[PDB]
Nucleic acid binder design. Structure first.
Length: 81
DNA sequence: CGGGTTTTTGTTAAGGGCTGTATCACTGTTTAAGACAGGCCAGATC
């Protein structure tokens, strides 16, 4: 009810229960059973309102499996060679 | 001192997805250096 960095996982849960309600219903009725992409783009927009295309591109990269992730074939290459 | 409230918290059990750590089967394929005690030959000696 006060802040969120100190509010725990379920404290935040009870804080935005109704946020979750609306977002899940709208998502799984509009995108035909999906919440990942809609919450993804929601956070992208709500952070890009502060024109932080650096973090936007970084998050789109981690969603695209390229950057600070080392896809398992790469780590396997390193362990072998 | 309370006392309605917040503000956050504690709890239940099924099943799964994930992760971290323990466990498992398994591989080496005789020493060498030095101390001491017999025992038996082997020579020095009466």
């Amino acid at each position: 009810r006060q802040h969120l960095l100190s509010l725990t996982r379920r404290a935040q849960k009870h804080r935005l229960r109704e946020l979750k309600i609306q977002v899940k219903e709208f998502a799984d009725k509009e995108e035909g059973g999906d919440v990942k992409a809609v919450c993804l783009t929601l956070f992208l927009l709500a952070l890009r309102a502060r024109n932080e295309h650096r973090q936007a591109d970084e998050l789109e990269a981690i969603m695209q499996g390229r950057g600070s992730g080392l896809q398992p074939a790469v780590c396997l290459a390193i362990r072998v060679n």
